[PDB]
């Protein structure tokens, strides 16, 4: 006593407009991000001869953002063809590894920056420069290793296929056949718990503490301002939140809590791509927020 | 992961450990990304779960439904 119900989704309609516009915006982001990050690294390396004390996190964060931007053109090529993957097998694995490592590096370094900034006005205030330099170097190496460990798995299982029916190539992920669901949820939930939730929580708490401390001290209040402090948290949220709501909605679709319908597939596809665009805008808004504003940096920019 | 390196379609993972007794509503999807699939609705948890077409009774039912 059962029933059979047939539902045929119409062939995917025209998608030239969306793909073309997203590629257009990606080119702008690539140019305006690569240029800014290169200048910041150059100034940071050059400043050390003027007696300044540049911060290692800024240099490492700049490198991480630069690496992420370099690989946008690969996605642009792979996107104009509606997710096809003409490139070879090694390209897919290598490109994903680079992107994942250098995108988690930036997210972790933001949290490390927040903690270091609070401690540098509360705790490190009477520590010799050598000790703080050593501590920062150790943390830099540790963060790189942690990002590499998190990113390795997804790259291991990646592989290409050619659809038997449609006969076009694709690059997907193949998991053990006895734990397919567990791996998918796990590897799309690690990017949401170790990518947004924990880093954002730490950043919010520690910048709030820094704001309270700076307000309590009259002398610091006159020079520094509390607009930039809250600007840091708001920029991170606005950039990343939409993407990690689309992904969290994609997971719900996998589990079939959301009933399926012809519209859901198209809506989720458009939402994921459009939101990933902003997720990368974060990679160019970073130098404009951390280095281009500091008065000392600008004075060093013109002189170099 | 970047969206390009993903595969999107109704069912991404099968569930073979299902019993003919606990099935109330089938569904034969047909999507360009994953060709024909099967989506069922268990009558206990009311959770839409995929189903593997290799099960014998599933095969007989589906051939009868489509051919007619």
């Amino acid at each position, epitope marked *: 006593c059962i029933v059979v119900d*047939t539902v045929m989704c119409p*062939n995917m309609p025209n998608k030239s407009v969306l793909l073309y516009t997203l590629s257009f915006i990606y080119i702008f982001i690539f140019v305006i991000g690569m240029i800014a990050n290169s200048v910041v690294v150059w100034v940071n390396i050059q400043a050390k001869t003027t007696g300044y004390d540049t911060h290692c996190y800024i240099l490492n964060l700049a490198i991480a953002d630069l690496w992420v931007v370099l690989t946008i053109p690969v996605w642009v090529v792979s996107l104009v063809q509606h997710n096809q993957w003409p490139m070879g097998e090694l390209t897919c694995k290598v490109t994903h590894l680079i992107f994942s490592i250098n995108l988690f590096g930036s997210i972790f370094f933001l949290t490390c920056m927040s903690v270091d900034r609070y401690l540098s006005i509360t705790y490190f205030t009477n520590t010799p420069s050598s000790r703080k330099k050593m501590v920062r170097r150790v943390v830099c190496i540790l963060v790189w290793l942690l990002a590499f460990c998190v990113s390795l798995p997804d790259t291991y299982y990646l592989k290409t296929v050619t*659809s038997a*029916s449609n006969n076009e190539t694709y690059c997907r992920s193949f998991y053990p056949e006895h734990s397919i669901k567990e791996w998918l949820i796990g590897m799309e939930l690690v990017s949401v718990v170790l990518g947004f939730a924990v880093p954002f929580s730490i950043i919010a708490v520690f910048y709030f503490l820094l704001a309270r401390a700076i307000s309590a001290s009259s002398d610091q209040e006159k020079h520094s301002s509390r607009k930039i402090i809250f600007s840091y948290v708001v920029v991170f949220l606005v950039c990343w939140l939409p993407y990690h709501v689309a992904v969290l909605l994609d997971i719900f679709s996998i589990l079939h809590y959301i009933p399926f319908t012809c519209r859901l597939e198209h809506a989720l596809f458009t939402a994921l791509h459009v939101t990933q665009c902003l997720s990368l805008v974060h990679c160019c808004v970073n130098p404009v927020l951390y280095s281009f504003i500091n008065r000392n940096y600008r004075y060093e920019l013109m002189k170099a | 992961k970047p969206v390009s390196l993903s595969y999107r379609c109704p069912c991404r993972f099968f569930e073979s450990h299902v019993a003919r007794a606990n099935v109330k509503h089938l569904k034969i999807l047909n999507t360009p990304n994953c060709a*024909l699939q099967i989506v069922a609705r268990l009558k206990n948890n009311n959770r839409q779960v995929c189903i593997d077409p290799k099960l014998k009774w599933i095969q007989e039912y*589906l051939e009868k439904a489509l051919n007619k």
Partner: antibody
Amino acid sequence: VQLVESGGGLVQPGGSLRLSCAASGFNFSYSSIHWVRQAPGKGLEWVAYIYSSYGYTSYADSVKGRFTISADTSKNTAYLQMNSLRAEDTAVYYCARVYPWWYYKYYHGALDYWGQGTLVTVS
Amino acid sequence: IQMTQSPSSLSASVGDRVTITCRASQSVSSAVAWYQQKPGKAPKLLIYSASSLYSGVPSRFSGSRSGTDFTLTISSLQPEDFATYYCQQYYYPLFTFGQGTKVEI
């Protein structure tokens, strides 16, 4: 189910012909149609297939760039037009239907029902 | 993806056991099928996937896999089971058929 072929007949070498496979008794807009050959006194051979609903098409190497394949869902019939026929194509052509179920690694491809087929000669 | 079937020719008698092997030059993930056709009729399907016996076929025929080596086993050859057996693979978009095996009294 019932599949019937039409169009088989004499053809001059280097000419063209058009065969139609008409299927009655199942959802044409779901299954996919497959054309295969059998040379006189030899084993079977694959030619091409058409996936009706979406129009995806693939072709065998030996007939790449020559045979054209179309599907009329309104007339639920499969058309195969052949041109520049060579002297090695004289055979018997069969029409089959396969339901492309989804398995994690591959799509179902077992030709279930075969039509009676028609003899195509190149003399 | 060239596919091979052996032995090309074979002989047996009613009440015997026969095995036919099919090998793939490349890896195919348990995606095969076995048909039989009479001397001048249309082919019929016997086994698909790798071992799932078709709906309307008796239980004499049984398929099995080993690495990449697909074997068909037939027991108690009835008089009607004197035909030509063909091995197919459908992993890749370009299907293929085996050379063909023949069995005679």
